[PDB]
Design an enzyme around this catalytic site. Structure first.
Site, PDB file in Angstrom:
ATOM      1  N   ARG A  55      27.924  34.874  -9.094  1.00 12.41           N
ATOM      2  CA  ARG A  55      26.804  34.298  -9.428  1.00 12.41           C
ATOM      3  C   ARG A  55      25.765  34.086  -8.254  1.00 12.41           C
ATOM      4  O   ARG A  55      26.239  33.819  -7.176  1.00 12.41           O
ATOM      5  CB  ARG A  55      26.902  33.187 -10.342  1.00 12.41           C
ATOM      6  CG  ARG A  55      27.263  31.794  -9.746  1.00 12.41           C
ATOM      7  CD  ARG A  55      27.315  30.542 -10.632  1.00 12.41           C
ATOM      8  NE  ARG A  55      27.875  29.308  -9.751  1.00 12.41           N
ATOM      9  CZ  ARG A  55      27.636  28.168 -10.446  1.00 12.41           C
ATOM     10  NH1 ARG A  55      27.509  27.888 -11.647  1.00 12.41           N
ATOM     11  NH2 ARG A  55      27.868  27.123  -9.549  1.00 12.41           N
ATOM     12  N   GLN A  73      29.344  20.780  -6.950  1.00 14.10           N
ATOM     13  CA  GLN A  73      30.280  19.703  -6.765  1.00 14.10           C
ATOM     14  C   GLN A  73      31.002  19.960  -5.609  1.00 14.10           C
ATOM     15  O   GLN A  73      31.145  18.838  -4.753  1.00 14.10           O
ATOM     16  CB  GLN A  73      31.132  19.351  -8.265  1.00 14.10           C
ATOM     17  CG  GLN A  73      30.327  18.605  -9.104  1.00 14.10           C
ATOM     18  CD  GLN A  73      29.916  19.850 -10.095  1.00 14.10           C
ATOM     19  OE1 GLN A  73      29.527  20.703  -9.878  1.00 14.10           O
ATOM     20  NE2 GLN A  73      29.983  19.437 -11.398  1.00 14.10           N
ATOM     21  N   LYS A 107       0.884  -1.263  -0.082  1.00  9.83           N
ATOM     22  CA  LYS A 107      -0.027   0.105  -0.010  1.00  9.83           C
ATOM     23  C   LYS A 107       0.775   1.265  -0.013  1.00  9.83           C
ATOM     24  O   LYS A 107       1.787   1.466   0.781  1.00  9.83           O
ATOM     25  CB  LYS A 107      -1.041   0.027   1.183  1.00  9.83           C
ATOM     26  CG  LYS A 107      -2.017   0.951   1.200  1.00  9.83           C
ATOM     27  CD  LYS A 107      -2.986   0.671  -0.202  1.00  9.83           C
ATOM     28  CE  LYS A 107      -4.435   0.088   0.522  1.00  9.83           C
ATOM     29  NZ  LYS A 107      -5.169  -0.651  -0.556  1.00  9.83           N
ATOM     30  N   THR A 119      -3.510  -5.400   0.432  1.00 11.98           N
ATOM     31  CA  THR A 119      -3.020  -4.172   0.694  1.00 11.98           C
ATOM     32  C   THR A 119      -3.832  -3.304   1.465  1.00 11.98           C
ATOM     33  O   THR A 119      -3.222  -2.668   2.388  1.00 11.98           O
ATOM     34  CB  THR A 119      -2.778  -3.393  -0.733  1.00 11.98           C
ATOM     35  OG1 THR A 119      -4.003  -2.993  -1.186  1.00 11.98           O
ATOM     36  CG2 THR A 119      -2.162  -4.228  -1.760  1.00 11.98           C
ATOM     37  N   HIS A 174      18.904  27.756 -12.319  1.00 14.68           N
ATOM     38  CA  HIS A 174      19.438  28.892 -12.763  1.00 14.68           C
ATOM     39  C   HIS A 174      18.750  30.216 -12.479  1.00 14.68           C
ATOM     40  O   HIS A 174      17.639  30.465 -13.115  1.00 14.68           O
ATOM     41  CB  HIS A 174      19.904  28.579 -14.104  1.00 14.68           C
ATOM     42  CG  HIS A 174      20.726  27.318 -14.148  1.00 14.68           C
ATOM     43  ND1 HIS A 174      21.990  27.141 -14.060  1.00 14.68           N
ATOM     44  CD2 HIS A 174      20.423  26.380 -15.219  1.00 14.68           C
ATOM     45  CE1 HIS A 174      22.221  25.963 -14.166  1.00 14.68           C
ATOM     46  NE2 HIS A 174      21.213  25.367 -14.757  1.00 14.68           N
TER      47      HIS A 174
HETATM   48  O1  LIG Z   1      28.309  24.432 -10.015  1.00 15.39           O
HETATM   49  C1  LIG Z   1      28.315  24.124 -11.381  1.00 15.39           C
HETATM   50  N1  LIG Z   1      28.667  22.884 -11.860  1.00 15.39           N
HETATM   51  C2  LIG Z   1      28.564  22.469 -13.007  1.00 15.39           C
HETATM   52  O2  LIG Z   1      28.737  21.384 -13.305  1.00 15.39           O
HETATM   53  C3  LIG Z   1      28.045  23.236 -13.937  1.00 15.39           C
HETATM   54  N2  LIG Z   1      27.811  23.218 -15.501  1.00 15.39           N
HETATM   55  N3  LIG Z   1      27.320  24.496 -15.615  1.00 15.39           N
HETATM   56  N4  LIG Z   1      27.313  25.246 -14.701  1.00 15.39           N
HETATM   57  C4  LIG Z   1      27.495  24.789 -13.619  1.00 15.39           C
HETATM   58  N5  LIG Z   1      27.781  25.061 -12.422  1.00 15.39           N
HETATM   59  O1  LIG Z   2      -5.556  -6.819  -6.893  1.00 16.22           O
HETATM   60  C1  LIG Z   2      -5.691  -6.617  -5.878  1.00 16.22           C
HETATM   61  N1  LIG Z   2      -4.303  -7.182  -5.100  1.00 16.22           N
HETATM   62  C2  LIG Z   2      -3.888  -6.985  -3.881  1.00 16.22           C
HETATM   63  O2  LIG Z   2      -2.770  -7.494  -3.616  1.00 16.22           O
HETATM   64  C3  LIG Z   2      -4.997  -6.271  -3.102  1.00 16.22           C
HETATM   65  N2  LIG Z   2      -5.018  -6.129  -1.926  1.00 16.22           N
HETATM   66  N3  LIG Z   2      -6.026  -5.474  -1.652  1.00 16.22           N
HETATM   67  N4  LIG Z   2      -6.913  -5.510  -2.576  1.00 16.22           N
HETATM   68  C4  LIG Z   2      -6.290  -5.939  -3.794  1.00 16.22           C
HETATM   69  N5  LIG Z   2      -6.567  -6.059  -5.010  1.00 16.22           N
END
Ligand SMILES: O=c1[nH]c(=O)c2nn[nH]c2[nH]1
Ligand SMILES: O=c1[nH]c(=O)c2nn[nH]c2[nH]1
Ligand SMILES: O=c1[nH]c(=O)c2nn[nH]c2[nH]1
Ligand SMILES: O=c1[nH]c(=O)c2nn[nH]c2[nH]1
Ligand code: NA
Ligand code: NA
Ligand code: NA
Ligand code: NA
Lengths: 295, 295, 295, 295
Positions: free
Chosen positions: B176, B228, B10, B57, B256
């Site tokens: 920048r 980086q 779920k 589920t 940017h």
């Molecule tokens: O910090 C940056 N890292 C990058 O790899 C990069 N490429 N363009 N501008 C950038 N600035």
């Molecule tokens: O098709 C279903 N599969 C499941 O595992 C399930 N669990 N609740 N309802 C469900 N329906």
């Protein structure tokens, strides 16, 4: 057929501006998303392929950047007023400019207990917005807002005494979770032009701060009878604390958290006073609105 | 044909839990989104319509809520370990449980300078996550992470001395903007079971706090030669400050911000040392990754 | 500490290409989002601020556009192979190129019953993708997929005979709704290089078409015992119809539609054979996976 | 202060309904997302904590499901009218019901050239919507729309002759890409009540089909002078083909595709008549609107 209404322009213009303090070295950043839509004597662009009346949306974009370069972008109420005024003054046939600004948060970082001069954090997707409508002959109309302010209280929310009929299954409660995304708008008195807007500039940041503070304190402290009752208290306080506001609007989702009955499993008690684990509901949601004015 | 791999369960199980302090009245909330996927002797459900081997589920969902009711949900490393261990111990034919937890922020509100006992704010969409893999005979493998931590610095980032050939147009720069969304993962030493995980519980919150603090301080303070070079400094520090971590992984977009040449308009200077207004670029983005271990 | 793994490049590169038929006037458009990440002798960019080993991500972006200009962008398996091969051949110290391509739909419009020569519609957000890993000395590894194929059947889905214990509340059923978003991947035999990839080019579009057709027909026609049983039938058929595929992977959410008991209101019958109105559930969802290979 | 406006209800109510043909075995599915907001004598819920005037949003949700069970959900104009009428007739103090419906696509699958009786595909996120406002004493006001119809044409779009001044950098063009997401609304003549809405039921599907067909054919065939000129042609045709419509509104983004100058690389020609590879721009976008009525 005929054109009954028309407006056009550029949407989703992202704008960043940095202010660098010569003396202190402290830098301050602003980031916005801007929309400008124009109205005027432009119907022939629709009906006759007359592009001579069109200020290109690309040019509107250029103008947003140029205006940001040459003017303050803060408070956004001021920037929007300047921007809108430009279009109706520059172009004889343009009679209205509608400016929407969404302000994004860049809050100064604290590093080792001290504010950093040029490093910022987006502390939440909460926005501060303005809608500024500059209309020739009708001055400047400003709506200010905060939105995407997401909050939750785990108790001191109630909802009982509502209408019960054959469509009703909701149980009355005196203790529930309340969670919402706050969208709050305050509408300013009409301003006659840029001089009057500028004369009130400090009030814009101050009133935003008030609106936010009132929202948070009222939400936290009100033993809420309903979303309706609580949001009204917020509005009434805001109106009392800024006389240049004419109305306050709230739009609040009720983001439901459902109890989970686990008694089918080993008699596990997880409802009522024993409720600990809840199921947050993505949908549906209550949606509650009001506009509050002066009596 | 034949089943080479299979897992099921779920996803997107939203969970809220409240803790209520008997003595102080202070309430604390936790909200998560949980995924549990199981492996085991289940291939016949795929090949022979044998549903007898399927823990539904829907039942996995029930079990998540029941386990949250009966155990701490914090730190998420512990909750995930408990949850995963349950499935492999309860079901003879289930041999692995893969538990992913996304923790959502509910930060206690400060009202009038004081912490509020039951009101919270989502202060950003930054998440704290775990991936907990509980495999019969192989103990408990935990990867902890923070993600969606969005930051920007307005200066003290450089990028020069990179390879230049006939595909290169990027100009070297010594000043920048640098902005990113931090995704940082630390991988724990294998744990033998729940007893050993529990014996280290305080380290999980502490190491998350360290990872976050190192990230923010290094980002803010490093006069960056590249994404980086900066991300490596973060990793190396984290490894030095928690010996129970084997590796640190970073994945960083370079979001940017482009200068805008406005000199075509009235000789406006907005590049180089005169750059004030920038165009945030939604796409594309540099994407820089590394995994750092001990030498 | 030391670099254990590193890769970097440009993500989210949007690319459009038009083909214009000289003789017929018919135009055909292609739109993609491309990511290229490189590995090689680049660790010193992380550890020593050695940017001399970095092919700038900006240059990688340029190269994507140049390669699209000079080569076919269809099938994406071919384009990705050409792109990846370029980087490892051009740069002595780059030893792997990892190319991800998401293809967006632009389906030719039919107007008045005839195909239009230059107008297109996005008929769904279904994507066709490739992951192409070009590694020096290890040839070209291609994974092809379709994703975001959203389907629903209103009957002829069953789920009974699953494990029942004290965690189980799910009722057995012999008639339910089944809805999913199909994510299906087929993994090609390793190719030795561009010559071998090119020698099989027609098979890529053909196998995508087969995968999609088998998915839709099996979904529609199988009186399904479970998601598990149905997805296995899809995989087995695909493997039988393309010998150059080694494995097929499916990842399928079970997007639940819940019955709504309305009997509390005027004895309204809306369950079982009387079920007409259902509540689509946004979350949680079953998540079912398998990888199927040859026996 | 005082309440100037108030409305409240339930948003994001997901609804599925299946119709099963007794004679043919053919099944047909409908899926919607519904919002109902109410107005009336409800201000005391805001001002006095008077919940007696509140029809609980939870009850509004129940009512949506009950109404879907007992009435056709197609066309959505009819369902919305029935739903809105229910609230103002059932509750003496409720004077307006505002119903928004988003219809999701479930198109019948064709398998081996034949329509399948119970299997469906979401063929695009295009929506069909209605806004139905039922106001006591003012009948039923219906706005119908289609939205999220995403299209592109690779030539036969022009934009020249627009205003040029010191804010203008956009070059005139006689051949560009045009792409948009169509949002088109047609506003019906006021209806007096349910009898009159029902008397026109076939017109709703027919007019939606007309609106869509006119949109696609006009987009494909118009050698476009501007977005403005093309969208006006669409509107005028729709008005001419359904007399019960009073206005047509379009809102169209201009989703820009930029040429890429590659001449810096080996003199590669990729502009003007040589333009093959383009950069789709995520933002900003032109936004063009108009409302067209009868002359
Ligand atoms: O910090 C940056 N890292 C990058 O790899 C990069 N490429 N363009 N501008 C950038 N600035
Ligand atoms: O098709 C279903 N599969 C499941 O595992 C399930 N669990 N609740 N309802 C469900 N329906
Ligand atoms: O605060 C609330 N207001 C409402 O109108 C409502 N309806 N259901 N629950 C509710 N809670
Ligand atoms: O069709 C267009 N209309 C416009 O108003 C415009 N402005 N820039 N490009 C444009 N294209
Ligand atoms: Na004017
Ligand atoms: Na087991
Ligand atoms: Na190489
Ligand atoms: Na009424």
């Amino acid at each position: 057929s005929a054109v009954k209404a028309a407006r056009y322009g550029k949407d989703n213009v992202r704008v960043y501006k940095v202010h660098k303090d010569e003396k202190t070295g402290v830098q301050t950043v602003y980031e916005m998303t801007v929309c400008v839509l124009l109205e005027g004597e432009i119907e022939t662009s629709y009906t006759k392929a007359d592009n001579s009346v069109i200020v290109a949306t690309d040019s509107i974009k250029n103008t947003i950047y140029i205006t940001a370069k040459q003017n303050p972008v803060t408070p956004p109420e001021l920037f929007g007023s300047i921007l809108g005024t430009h279009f109706i003054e520059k172009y004889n046939h343009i009679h209205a400019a509608h400016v929407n600004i969404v302000c994004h948060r860049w809050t100064r970082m604290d590093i080792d207990g001290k504010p950093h001069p040029h490093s910022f954090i987006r502390d939440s997707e909460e926005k501060r917005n303005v809608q500024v409508d500059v209309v020739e002959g009708k001055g400047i109309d400003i709506k200010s807002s905060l939105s995407g302010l997401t909050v939750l209280k785990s108790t001191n929310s109630q909802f009982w005494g509502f209408l019960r009929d054959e469509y009703t299954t909701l149980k009355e409660t005196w203790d529930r979770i309340l969670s919402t995304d706050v969208d709050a708008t305050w509408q300013w008195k009409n301003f006659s032009g840029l001089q009057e807007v500028r004369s009130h500039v400090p009030k814009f940041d101050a009133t935003w701060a008030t609106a936010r503070e009132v929202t948070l304190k009222t939400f936290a402290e009100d033993n809420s009878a309903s979303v309706q009752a609580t949001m009204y208290k917020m509005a009434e306080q805001i109106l009392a604390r800024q006389q240049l506001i004419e109305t306050v609007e709230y739009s609040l989702p009720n983001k439901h958290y459902f109890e989970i009955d686990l008694s089918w499993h080993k008699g596990l008690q997880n409802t009522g006073k024993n409720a600990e684990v809840f199921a947050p509901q993505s949908d549906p949601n209550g949606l509650i609105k009001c506009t509050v004015g002066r009596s």
